[PDB]
Design a protein around this ligand. Structure first.
Ligand SMILES: Cn1c(=O)c2c(c3cc(Nc4ccnc(Cl)c4C#N)ccc31)N[C@@H](C1CC1)C(F)(F)CO2
Ligand SMILES: Cn1c(=O)c2c(c3cc(Nc4ccnc(Cl)c4C#N)ccc31)N[C@@H](C1CC1)C(F)(F)CO2
Ligand SMILES: [Cl-]
Ligand SMILES: [Cl-]
Lengths: 130, 130
């Protein structure tokens, strides 16, 4: 449940994961979602704070004085919707559903979105299959 | 960095804590904060999604069709501002700064805010000092 942290302060082991679980439940129920990400013919509702916390691209967009107030964000039409969906799920769950059939699209999408450790992980899995 | 989850899916160990760290950085810079919590003469800016994810009281308030749109929320004037501050910091960090001089106020505030495991932890620490 809790432990003594290195800073001599009480820390709750599952707190961060339980907060993320609740943020994903709010997303699933469309509660307090404040942006729709458009990827070709597909739309994905989300919370800007979670997107900024998980992506260098979204962090840049939503800290821009003009774009921070947009309710619709259109991604590059070359982005694969399934690749984006897999990464949005990862943002809200810490689970990345990589498969042989989606890894190239997930990697290209993570490069565009500036999610470096995901890109590095994709490169390592690709290197193992060559 | 990552591991094979029980659901045979790749999971990133530090993802949830790193997201929470970024949400606290946005709070510290007042980025995308969408509510001010008023506690007697003190004001605390925050993100409604994080408050709802961490409190039964805030979850009820921000799911109410009328209150979900309020930009200012006034707490009961009997709530101690320091106790609220300690709990808001806990929400964004997983670290609870309990001390002999603040534990009663933190416990009463956590009861009001419906943060059960925090209340239980406070009760256990109080029981040890009697
Ligand atoms: C480059 N980059 C990544 O490669 C990356 C990111 C990531 C996040 C920001 N956002 C921030 C940076 C710094 N400060 C502030 Cl307030 C914010 C905010 N808000 C920026 C660049 C990023 N986030 C992680 C999650 C934390 C775990 C991710 F795994 F989802 C993908 O990897
Ligand atoms: C009663 N109660 C607590 O006692 C409690 C809570 C807590 C949260 C909600 N919020 C939700 C519930 C269910 N579903 C959805 Cl979408 C939401 C949302 N959003 C409700 C009741 C709660 N949150 C945890 C953090 C998760 C770790 C806390 F540690 F900060 C304090 O303990
Ligand atoms: Cl302990
Ligand atoms: Cl592994």
């Amino acid at each position: 449940l809790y432990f003594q942290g290195a800073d001599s302060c009480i820390q709750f082991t599952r707190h961060a994961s339980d907060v993320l679980l609740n943020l994903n439940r709010l997303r699933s129920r469309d509660i307090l979602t404040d942006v729709v990400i458009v990827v070709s013919r597909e739309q994905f509702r989300a919370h800007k704070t979670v997107l900024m916390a998980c992506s260098g691209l979204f962090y840049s967009i939503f800290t821009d004085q003009l774009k921070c107030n947009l309710s619709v964000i259109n991604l590059d039409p070359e982005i694969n919707p399934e690749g984006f969906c897999i990464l949005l799920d990862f943002m809200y769950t810490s689970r990345l559903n990589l498969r042989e059939g989606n890894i190239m699209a997930v990697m290209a999408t993570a490069m565009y979105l500036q999610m470096e450790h995901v890109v590095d992980t994709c490169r390592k899995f690709i290197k193992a299959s060559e």
